[PDB]
Structures are given as structure tokens and as C-alpha cells.
Short mmCIF file of C-alpha atoms and ligand atoms in Angstrom, two decimals:
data_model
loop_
_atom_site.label_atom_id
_atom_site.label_comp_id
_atom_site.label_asym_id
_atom_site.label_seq_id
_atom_site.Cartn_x
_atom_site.Cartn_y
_atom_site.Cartn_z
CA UNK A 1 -6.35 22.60 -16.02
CA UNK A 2 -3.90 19.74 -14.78
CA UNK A 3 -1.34 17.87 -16.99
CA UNK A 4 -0.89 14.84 -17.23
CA UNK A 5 1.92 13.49 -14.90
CA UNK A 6 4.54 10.91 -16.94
CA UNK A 7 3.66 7.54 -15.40
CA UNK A 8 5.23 4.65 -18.23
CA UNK A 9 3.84 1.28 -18.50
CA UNK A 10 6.77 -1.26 -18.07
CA UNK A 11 6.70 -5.17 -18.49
CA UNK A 12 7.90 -6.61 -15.48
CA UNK A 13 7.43 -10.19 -16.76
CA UNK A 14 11.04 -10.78 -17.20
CA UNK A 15 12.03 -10.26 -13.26
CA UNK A 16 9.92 -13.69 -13.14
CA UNK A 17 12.41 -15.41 -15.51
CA UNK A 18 15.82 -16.28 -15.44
CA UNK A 19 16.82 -13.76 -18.56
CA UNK A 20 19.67 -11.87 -16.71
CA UNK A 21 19.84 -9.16 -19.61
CA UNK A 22 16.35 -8.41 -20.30
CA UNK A 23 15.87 -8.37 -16.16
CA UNK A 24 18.73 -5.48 -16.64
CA UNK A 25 16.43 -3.94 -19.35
CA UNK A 26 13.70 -3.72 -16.85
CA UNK A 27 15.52 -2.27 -13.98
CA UNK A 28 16.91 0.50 -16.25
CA UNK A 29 13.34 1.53 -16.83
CA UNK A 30 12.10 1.31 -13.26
CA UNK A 31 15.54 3.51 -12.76
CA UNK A 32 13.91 6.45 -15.23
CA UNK A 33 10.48 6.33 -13.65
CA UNK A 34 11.71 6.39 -9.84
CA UNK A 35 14.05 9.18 -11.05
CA UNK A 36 11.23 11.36 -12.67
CA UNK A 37 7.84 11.21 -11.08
CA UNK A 38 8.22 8.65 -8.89
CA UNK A 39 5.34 6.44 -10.29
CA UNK A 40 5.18 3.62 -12.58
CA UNK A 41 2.16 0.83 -14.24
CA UNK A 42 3.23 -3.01 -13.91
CA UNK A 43 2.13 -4.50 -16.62
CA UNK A 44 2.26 -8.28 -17.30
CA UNK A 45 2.10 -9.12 -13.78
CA UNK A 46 0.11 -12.13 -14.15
CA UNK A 47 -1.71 -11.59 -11.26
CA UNK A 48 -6.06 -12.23 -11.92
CA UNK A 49 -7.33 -8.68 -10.97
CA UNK A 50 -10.33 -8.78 -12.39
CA UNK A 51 -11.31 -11.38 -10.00
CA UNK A 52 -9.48 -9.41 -7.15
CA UNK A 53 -12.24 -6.42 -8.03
CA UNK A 54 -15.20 -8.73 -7.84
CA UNK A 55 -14.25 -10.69 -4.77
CA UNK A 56 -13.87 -7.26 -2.78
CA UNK A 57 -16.62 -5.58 -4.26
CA UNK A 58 -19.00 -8.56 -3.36
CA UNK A 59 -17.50 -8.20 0.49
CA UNK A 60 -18.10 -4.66 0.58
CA UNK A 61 -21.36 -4.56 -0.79
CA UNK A 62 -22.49 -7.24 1.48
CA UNK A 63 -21.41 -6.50 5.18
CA UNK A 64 -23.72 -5.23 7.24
CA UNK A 65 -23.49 -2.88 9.98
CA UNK A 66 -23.38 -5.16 12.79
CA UNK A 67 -20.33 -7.13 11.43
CA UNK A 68 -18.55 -3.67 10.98
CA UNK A 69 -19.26 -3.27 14.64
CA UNK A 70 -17.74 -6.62 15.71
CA UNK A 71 -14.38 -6.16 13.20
CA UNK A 72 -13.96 -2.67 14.10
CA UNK A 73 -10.66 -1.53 14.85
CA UNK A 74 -9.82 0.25 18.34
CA UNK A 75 -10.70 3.30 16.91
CA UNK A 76 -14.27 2.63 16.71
CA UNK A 77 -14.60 -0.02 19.25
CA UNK A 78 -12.59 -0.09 22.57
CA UNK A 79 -13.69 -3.05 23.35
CA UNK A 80 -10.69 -4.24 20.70
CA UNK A 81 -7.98 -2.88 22.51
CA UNK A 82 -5.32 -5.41 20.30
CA UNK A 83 -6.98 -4.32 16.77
CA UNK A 84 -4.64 -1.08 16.13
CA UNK A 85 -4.03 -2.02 12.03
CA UNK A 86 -6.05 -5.41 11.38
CA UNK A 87 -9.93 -4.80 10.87
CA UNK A 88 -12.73 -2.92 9.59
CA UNK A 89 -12.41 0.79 9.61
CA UNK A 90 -16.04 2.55 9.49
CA UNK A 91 -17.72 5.53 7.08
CA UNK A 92 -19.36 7.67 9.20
CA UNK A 93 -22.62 9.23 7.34
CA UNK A 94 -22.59 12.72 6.94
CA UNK A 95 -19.06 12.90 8.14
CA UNK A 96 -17.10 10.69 6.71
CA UNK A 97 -17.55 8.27 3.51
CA UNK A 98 -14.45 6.35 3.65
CA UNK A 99 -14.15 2.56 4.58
CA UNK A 100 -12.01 -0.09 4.70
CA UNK A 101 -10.67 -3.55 5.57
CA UNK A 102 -7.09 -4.07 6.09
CA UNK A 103 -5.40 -7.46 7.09
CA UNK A 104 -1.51 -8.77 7.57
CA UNK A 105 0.04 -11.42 7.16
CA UNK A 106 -1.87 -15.06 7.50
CA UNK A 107 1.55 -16.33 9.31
CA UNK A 108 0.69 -13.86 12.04
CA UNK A 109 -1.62 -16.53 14.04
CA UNK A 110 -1.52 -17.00 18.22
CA UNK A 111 1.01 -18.83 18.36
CA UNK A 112 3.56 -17.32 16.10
CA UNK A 113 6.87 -15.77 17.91
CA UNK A 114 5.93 -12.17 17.56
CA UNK A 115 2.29 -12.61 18.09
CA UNK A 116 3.02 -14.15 21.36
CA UNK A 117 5.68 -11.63 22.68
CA UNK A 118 3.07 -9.04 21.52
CA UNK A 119 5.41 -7.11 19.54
CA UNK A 120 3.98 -3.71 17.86
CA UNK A 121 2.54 -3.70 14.89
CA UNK A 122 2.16 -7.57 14.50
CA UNK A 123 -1.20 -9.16 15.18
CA UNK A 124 -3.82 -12.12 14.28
CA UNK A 125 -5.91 -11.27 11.25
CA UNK A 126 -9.78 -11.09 12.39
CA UNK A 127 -12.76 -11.99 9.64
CA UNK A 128 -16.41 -12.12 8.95
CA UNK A 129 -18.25 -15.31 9.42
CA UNK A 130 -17.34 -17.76 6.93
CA UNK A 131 -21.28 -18.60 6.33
CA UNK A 132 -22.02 -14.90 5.72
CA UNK A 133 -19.07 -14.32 3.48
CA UNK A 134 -18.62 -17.55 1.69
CA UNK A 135 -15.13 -17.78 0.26
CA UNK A 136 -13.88 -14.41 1.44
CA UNK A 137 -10.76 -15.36 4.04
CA UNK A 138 -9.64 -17.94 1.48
CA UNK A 139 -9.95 -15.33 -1.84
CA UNK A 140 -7.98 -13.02 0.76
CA UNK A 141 -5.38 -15.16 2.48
CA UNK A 142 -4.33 -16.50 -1.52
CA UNK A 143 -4.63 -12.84 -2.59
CA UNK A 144 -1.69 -11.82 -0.11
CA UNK A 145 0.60 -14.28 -1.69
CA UNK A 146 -0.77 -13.83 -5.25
CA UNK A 147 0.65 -9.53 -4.66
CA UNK A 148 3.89 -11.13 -2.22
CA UNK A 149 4.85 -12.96 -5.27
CA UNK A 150 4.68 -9.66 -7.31
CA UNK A 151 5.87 -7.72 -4.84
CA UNK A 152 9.02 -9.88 -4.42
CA UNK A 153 9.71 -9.81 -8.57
CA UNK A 154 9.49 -5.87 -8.10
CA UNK A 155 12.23 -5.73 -5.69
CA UNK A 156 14.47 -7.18 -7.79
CA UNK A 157 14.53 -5.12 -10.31
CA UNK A 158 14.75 -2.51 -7.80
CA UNK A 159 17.78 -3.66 -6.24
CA UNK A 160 19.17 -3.92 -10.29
CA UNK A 161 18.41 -0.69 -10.82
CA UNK A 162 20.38 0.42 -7.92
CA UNK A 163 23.48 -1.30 -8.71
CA UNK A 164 22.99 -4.11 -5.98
CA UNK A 165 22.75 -8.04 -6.66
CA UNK A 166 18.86 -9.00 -7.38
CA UNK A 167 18.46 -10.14 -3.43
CA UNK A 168 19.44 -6.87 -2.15
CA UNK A 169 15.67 -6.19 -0.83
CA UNK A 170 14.20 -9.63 -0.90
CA UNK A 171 16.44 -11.26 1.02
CA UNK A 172 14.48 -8.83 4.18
CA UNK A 173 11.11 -9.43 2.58
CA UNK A 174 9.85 -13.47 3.68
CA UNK A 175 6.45 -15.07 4.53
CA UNK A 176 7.06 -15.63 7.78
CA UNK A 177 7.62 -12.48 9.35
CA UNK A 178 6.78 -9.18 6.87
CA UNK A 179 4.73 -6.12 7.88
CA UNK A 180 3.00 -6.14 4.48
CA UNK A 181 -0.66 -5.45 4.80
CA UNK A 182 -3.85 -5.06 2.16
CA UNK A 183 -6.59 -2.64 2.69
CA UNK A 184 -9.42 -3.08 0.76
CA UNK A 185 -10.90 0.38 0.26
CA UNK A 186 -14.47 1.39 -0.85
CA UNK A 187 -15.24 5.09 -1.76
CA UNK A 188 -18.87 5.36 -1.91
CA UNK A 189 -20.98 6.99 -4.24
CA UNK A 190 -23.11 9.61 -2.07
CA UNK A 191 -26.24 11.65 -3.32
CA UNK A 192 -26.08 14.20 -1.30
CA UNK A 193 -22.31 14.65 -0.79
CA UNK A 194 -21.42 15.46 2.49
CA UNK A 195 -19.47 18.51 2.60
CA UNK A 196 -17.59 17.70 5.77
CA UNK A 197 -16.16 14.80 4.04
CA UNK A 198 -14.70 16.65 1.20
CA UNK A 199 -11.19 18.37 2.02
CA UNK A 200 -9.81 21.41 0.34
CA UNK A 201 -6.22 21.52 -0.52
CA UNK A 202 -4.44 25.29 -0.75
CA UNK A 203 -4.80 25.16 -4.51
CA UNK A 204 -8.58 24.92 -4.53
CA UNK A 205 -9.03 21.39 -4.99
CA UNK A 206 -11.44 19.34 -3.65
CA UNK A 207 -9.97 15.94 -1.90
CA UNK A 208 -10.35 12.58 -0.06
CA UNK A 209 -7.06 12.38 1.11
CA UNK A 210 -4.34 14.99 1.70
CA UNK A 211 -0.96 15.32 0.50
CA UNK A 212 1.38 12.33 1.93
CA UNK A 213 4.65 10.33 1.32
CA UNK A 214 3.78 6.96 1.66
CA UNK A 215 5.06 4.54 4.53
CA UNK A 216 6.53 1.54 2.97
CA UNK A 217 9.31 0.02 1.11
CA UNK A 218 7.58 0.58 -1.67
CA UNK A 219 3.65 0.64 -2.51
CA UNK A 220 1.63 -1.83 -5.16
CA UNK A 221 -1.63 -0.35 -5.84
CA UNK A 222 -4.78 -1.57 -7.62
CA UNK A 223 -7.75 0.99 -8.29
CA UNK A 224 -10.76 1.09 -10.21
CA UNK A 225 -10.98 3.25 -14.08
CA UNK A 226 -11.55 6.45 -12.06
CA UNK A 227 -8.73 8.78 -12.44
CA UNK A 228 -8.47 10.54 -8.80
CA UNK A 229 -4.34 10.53 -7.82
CA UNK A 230 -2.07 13.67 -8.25
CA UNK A 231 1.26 13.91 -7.92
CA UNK A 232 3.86 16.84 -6.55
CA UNK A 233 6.76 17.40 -9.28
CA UNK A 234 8.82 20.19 -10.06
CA UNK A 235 5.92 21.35 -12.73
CA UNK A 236 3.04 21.13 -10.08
CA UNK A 237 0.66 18.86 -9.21
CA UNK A 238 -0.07 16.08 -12.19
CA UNK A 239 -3.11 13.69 -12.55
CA UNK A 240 -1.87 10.14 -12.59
CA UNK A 241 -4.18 7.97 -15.33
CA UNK A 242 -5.86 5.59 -14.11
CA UNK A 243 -4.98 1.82 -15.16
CA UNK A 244 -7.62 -0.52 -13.59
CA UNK A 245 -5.16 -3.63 -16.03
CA UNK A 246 -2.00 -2.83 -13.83
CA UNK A 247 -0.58 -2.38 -10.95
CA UNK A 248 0.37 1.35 -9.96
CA UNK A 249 3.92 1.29 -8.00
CA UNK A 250 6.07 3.82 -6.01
CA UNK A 251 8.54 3.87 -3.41
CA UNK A 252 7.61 4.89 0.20
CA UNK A 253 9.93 6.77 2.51
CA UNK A 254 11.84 3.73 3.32
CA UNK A 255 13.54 3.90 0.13
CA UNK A 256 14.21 7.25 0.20
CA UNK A 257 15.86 6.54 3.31
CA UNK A 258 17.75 3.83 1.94
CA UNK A 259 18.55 5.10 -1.04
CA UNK A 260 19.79 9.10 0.40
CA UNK A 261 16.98 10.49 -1.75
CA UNK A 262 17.89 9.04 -5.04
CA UNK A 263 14.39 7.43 -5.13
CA UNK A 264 12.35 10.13 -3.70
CA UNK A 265 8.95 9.07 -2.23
CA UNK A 266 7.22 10.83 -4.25
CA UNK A 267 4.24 13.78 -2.52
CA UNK A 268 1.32 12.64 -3.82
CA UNK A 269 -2.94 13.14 -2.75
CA UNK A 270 -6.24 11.73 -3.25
CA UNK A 271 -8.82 13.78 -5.18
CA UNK A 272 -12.55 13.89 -4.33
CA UNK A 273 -14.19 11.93 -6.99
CA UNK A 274 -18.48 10.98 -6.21
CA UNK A 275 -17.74 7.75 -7.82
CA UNK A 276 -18.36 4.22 -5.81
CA UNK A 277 -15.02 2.75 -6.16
CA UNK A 278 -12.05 0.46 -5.62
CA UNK A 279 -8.89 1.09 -4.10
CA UNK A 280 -6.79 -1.57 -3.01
CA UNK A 281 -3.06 -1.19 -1.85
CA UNK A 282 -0.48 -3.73 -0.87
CA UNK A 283 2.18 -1.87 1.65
CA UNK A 284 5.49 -3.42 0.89
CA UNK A 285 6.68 -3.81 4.45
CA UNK A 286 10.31 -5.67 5.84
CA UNK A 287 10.44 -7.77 8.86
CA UNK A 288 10.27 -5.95 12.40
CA UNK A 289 14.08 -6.33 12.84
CA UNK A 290 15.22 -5.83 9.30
CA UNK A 291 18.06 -2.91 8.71
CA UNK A 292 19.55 -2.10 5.40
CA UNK A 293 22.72 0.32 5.59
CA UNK A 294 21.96 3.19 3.61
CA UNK A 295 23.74 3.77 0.76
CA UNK A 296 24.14 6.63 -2.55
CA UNK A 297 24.01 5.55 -5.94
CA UNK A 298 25.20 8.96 -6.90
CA UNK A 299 28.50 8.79 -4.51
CA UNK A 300 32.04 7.70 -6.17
CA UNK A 301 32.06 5.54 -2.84
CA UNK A 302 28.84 4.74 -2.21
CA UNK A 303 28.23 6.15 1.10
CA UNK A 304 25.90 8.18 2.99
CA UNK A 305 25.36 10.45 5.95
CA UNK A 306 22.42 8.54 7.03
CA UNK A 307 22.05 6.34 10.05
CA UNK A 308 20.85 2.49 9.52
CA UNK A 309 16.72 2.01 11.16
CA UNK A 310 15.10 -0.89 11.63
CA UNK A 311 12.00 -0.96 9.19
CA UNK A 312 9.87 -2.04 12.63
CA UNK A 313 11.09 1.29 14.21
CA UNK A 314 10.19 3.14 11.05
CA UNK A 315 6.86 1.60 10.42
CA UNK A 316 5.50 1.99 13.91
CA UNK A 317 6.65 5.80 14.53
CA UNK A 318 5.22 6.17 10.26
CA UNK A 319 1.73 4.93 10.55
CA UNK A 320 1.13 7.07 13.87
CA UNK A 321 2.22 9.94 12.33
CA UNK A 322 0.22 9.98 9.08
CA UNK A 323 -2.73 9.01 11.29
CA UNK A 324 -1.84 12.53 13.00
CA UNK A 325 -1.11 14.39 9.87
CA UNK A 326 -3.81 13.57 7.75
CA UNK A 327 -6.72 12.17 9.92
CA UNK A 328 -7.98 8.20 11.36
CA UNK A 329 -9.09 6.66 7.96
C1 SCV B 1 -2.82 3.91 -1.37
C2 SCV B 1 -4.27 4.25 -1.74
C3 SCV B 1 -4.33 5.57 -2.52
C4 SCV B 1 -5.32 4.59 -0.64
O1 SCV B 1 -4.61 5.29 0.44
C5 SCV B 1 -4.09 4.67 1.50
O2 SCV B 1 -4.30 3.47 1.73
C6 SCV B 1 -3.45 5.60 2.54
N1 SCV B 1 -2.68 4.75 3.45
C7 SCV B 1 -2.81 4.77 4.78
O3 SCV B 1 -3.80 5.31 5.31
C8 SCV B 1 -1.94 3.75 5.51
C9 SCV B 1 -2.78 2.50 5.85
C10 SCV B 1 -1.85 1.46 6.54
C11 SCV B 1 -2.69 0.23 6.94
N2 SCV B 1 -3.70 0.44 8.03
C12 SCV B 1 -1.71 -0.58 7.77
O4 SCV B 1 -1.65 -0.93 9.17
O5 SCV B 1 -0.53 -1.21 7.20
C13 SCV B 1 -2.62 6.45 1.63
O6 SCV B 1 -3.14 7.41 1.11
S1 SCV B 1 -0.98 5.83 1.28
C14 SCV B 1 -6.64 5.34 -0.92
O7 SCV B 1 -6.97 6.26 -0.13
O8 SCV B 1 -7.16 5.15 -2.04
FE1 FE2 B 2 -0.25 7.09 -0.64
#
């Protein structure tokens, strides 16, 4: 069979504090796990995810078809020429089972700087009808800070870890201008199947989502008790555990950029599992004009052969290319 892959459970409740030591504790651990497989479990978070599961689940179970129509993305609709990231993406039966709802930041509204000079990859969340989906913007709009908050506590012990002050990566990540986005993903339970929806890597295995380096910063992941992610080490591929308590974290290729491979982004894929289930990412994303000069950690000086890109640069060119690579989702 598969191993297991080595994915430690670390308490991250100290990068909320003011315990400079024990936050040095922390970021020694998030060192080891970025250094080995790439993956680690947040534990202690303090964020309500529970609650997160049965808000979405409550969404996705009751949007109809038409709805999907009118939130559709450009992909599905071309009537929605502005809706390239923000919207509902649609299953298509017998093809494909996958669906989802992503959304950005609530700063980005009409008249916000970048809104209005219509710069890529920033645009006006859209949403059901608040009578037909009682609750659901608000739930979603305080959900997005609940995982920023997180999110930002993360980063510091990431910067720690990397022998930079606490700030090194926050000071780029603020409410009024990051790329971060939520997709609220439902994987269906389907009886029959559909065999065109199933993909087949080279090693036989049956999959939802091909093999990928994710494009972020860093990526904070909530799923549902069905094990289904695999990782690429030096051993193979490794089943991840699934953890639906914490918070499942990696760095994108942003940080491997960043970092001149000392924090890979670690190759990892999505397993076919006929399950109906949860999958709900946060993309860790900097402003559109934020550049961090890339550094190495395993240098005597510090430097690297790397040139310095704007994370708006790299996220634009990133989420084209994985749509190319591994299919519209
Ligand atoms: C991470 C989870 C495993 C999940 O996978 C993802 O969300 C898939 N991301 C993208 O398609 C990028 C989506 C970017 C989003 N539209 C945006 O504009 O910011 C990856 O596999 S990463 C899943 O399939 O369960
Ligand atoms: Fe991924």
C-alpha cells in the first residue's frame, strides 16, 4: 500500500501571545515540518470550525441550479465577463462532479482603488440572495477575518523560523488590499460514478485532482474526516491523515521562491474518494504590489541568485497556469 506521510500536530497558540520564547519554540517546529514533508496540522487555532462545516454545508446543499447560473464565473457564463476568480464554479453531471464557491476580500467593493482601476485579479465579491440564503454573506465575510487572523499568527512564526523579525511576512499581508481568497468546495457523493470524472495518475491511482504545487504564500486548509491528499517525498507518494479539528498548512511556490527552495512547496494531489465532502482552503495571498527580496537561510551571507517578483505578477501568471495544467475546476 501507501505510508503514511509525517504530518506533526503543532500548537500554534503561542504566536497569539506575547511569550517571545515559546513563539521561538513554535517556529522551530514549523522549521522541521517545512523542511521534511512540507505539511503540518494547526492545532489550537481557536478558530469555530465546526460551525464553518455546517454553515457551508447548509449553502451547498441548498443552492439551486438557477442561482449557480446567475453566480457563475466566466467560464460557465459569458455573460460575466469581470467574474474570472469570484463566483460559483459548476459540476457538470456525467462529466464533472466538482463544485465550488470562491470569494476575496470584502474590502474589494466598487469603489475601492484597485477595483476601480480594474487591476487583475482584484474584483467585487458576488452572492446569493440574502432571503434564499439567510445569514450566508455575513457567516462568510466574518469567516475571512476569523482564517486572516490565523493566517497572520502563522506567518509569524514563519518569518521566526527563518531567522527574520516576526513582521517579516505580515507586514505585506493587510485587510485592505490582500489577494487571499476562500473556496468552499463540495465533492459529491455519486451513485453511479462517472468515469470521465475520475483521473488516473501514472502510478495507477485513481484522482480528483492532479499533481500540483500550490500558488500562494502559503495555504490554510480545512477538510472533512475523509483521508484523500498525497504527498511527493523522497520515499514516494504518502497519504496525509485527515484532521477535520485542525487546520492543514503548507507553503505555496511563493515561498519557495522567497526562501531559494529551503521551504519547498511541497508536490502534492487529490485522490478520488465517492464520499460527499468538505474542502475548504484559504490561499494566503500578498498585496498586488508586494515584493520580498529573496533570500537563503542556508547561505553564510544570506543571499540568493533569485530575482525579487511582485506577488501580483506571480499570482496572475500562477492561477492561469494551473488552470492549463490541471484543468478549469
Ligand atoms: C486546496 C484543496 C485541496 C482543494 O484544491 C484547490 O483548491 C486547488 N486550488 C486551485 O484550483 C486554485 C483556486 C484559486 C481560487 N479560484 C482563486 O482565484 O484564488 C488545489 O488543488 S491547490 C481541493 O481540491 O480539495
Ligand atoms: Fe493544492
Amino acid at each position: 500500500s501507501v505510508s503514511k506521510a509525517n504530518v506533526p500536530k503543532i500548537d500554534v497558540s503561542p504566536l497569539f501571545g506575547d511569550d517571545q520564547a515559546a513563539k521561538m519554540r513554535v517556529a522551530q517546529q514549523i522549521d522541521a515540518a517545512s523542511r521534511d514533508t512540507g505539511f503540518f496540522y494547526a492545532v489550537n487555532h481557536g478558530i469555530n470550525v465546526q460551525r464553518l462545516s455546517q454553515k457551508t454545508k447548509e449553502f451547498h446543499m441548498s443552492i439551486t441550479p438557477e442561482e449557480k447560473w446567475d453566480l457563475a464565473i466566466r467560464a460557465y457564463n459569458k455573460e460575466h465577463q469581470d467574474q474570472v476568480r469570484a463566483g460559483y464554479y459548476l459540476s457538470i453531471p456525467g462529466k464533472k462532479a466538482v463544485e465550488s464557491f470562491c470569494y476575496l476580500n470584502p474590502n474589494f467593493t466598487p469603489d475601492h482603488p484597485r477595483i476601480q482601476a480594474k487591476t487583475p485579479t482584484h474584483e467585487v465579491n458576488v452572492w446569493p440572495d440574502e432571503t434564499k440564503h439567510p445569514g450566508f454573506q455575513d457567516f462568510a465575510e466574518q469567516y475571512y477575518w476569523d482564517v486572516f487572523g490565523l493566517s497572520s499568527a502563522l506567518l509569524k512564526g514563519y518569518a521566526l523560523a527563518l531567522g527574520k523579525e516576526e513582521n517579516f511576512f505580515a507586514r505585506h499581508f493587510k485587510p485592505d488590499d490582500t489577494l487571499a481568497s476562500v473556496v468552499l468546495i463540495r465533492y459529491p457523493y455519486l451513485d453511479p460514478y462517472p468515469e470521465a470524472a475520475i483521473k488516473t495518475a501514472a502510478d495507477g491511482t485513481k484522482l480528483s485532482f492532479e499533481w500540483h504545487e500550490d500558488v500562494s504564500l502559503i495555504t490554510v486548509l480545512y477538510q472533512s474526516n475523509v483521508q484523500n491528499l498525497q504527498v511527493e517525498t523522497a520515499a514516494g507518494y504518502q497519504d496525509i491523515e485527515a484532521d477535520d479539528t485542525g487546520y492543514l498548512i503548507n507553503c505555496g511556490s511563493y515561498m519557495a521562491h522567497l526562501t531559494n527552495n529551503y521551504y519547498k512547496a511541497p508536490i502534492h494531489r487529490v485522490k478520488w474518494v465517492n464520499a460527499e465532502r468538505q474542502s475548504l482552503p484559504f490561499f494566503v495571498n500578498l498585496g498586488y504590489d508586494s515584493v520580498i527580496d529573496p533570500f537563503d537561510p542556508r547561505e553564510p551571507n544570506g543571499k540568493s541568485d533569485r530575482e525579487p517578483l511582485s506577488y501580483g505578477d506571480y499570482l496572475q501568471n500562477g492561477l492561469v497556469s494551473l488552470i492549463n495544467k490541471n484543468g478549469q475546476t
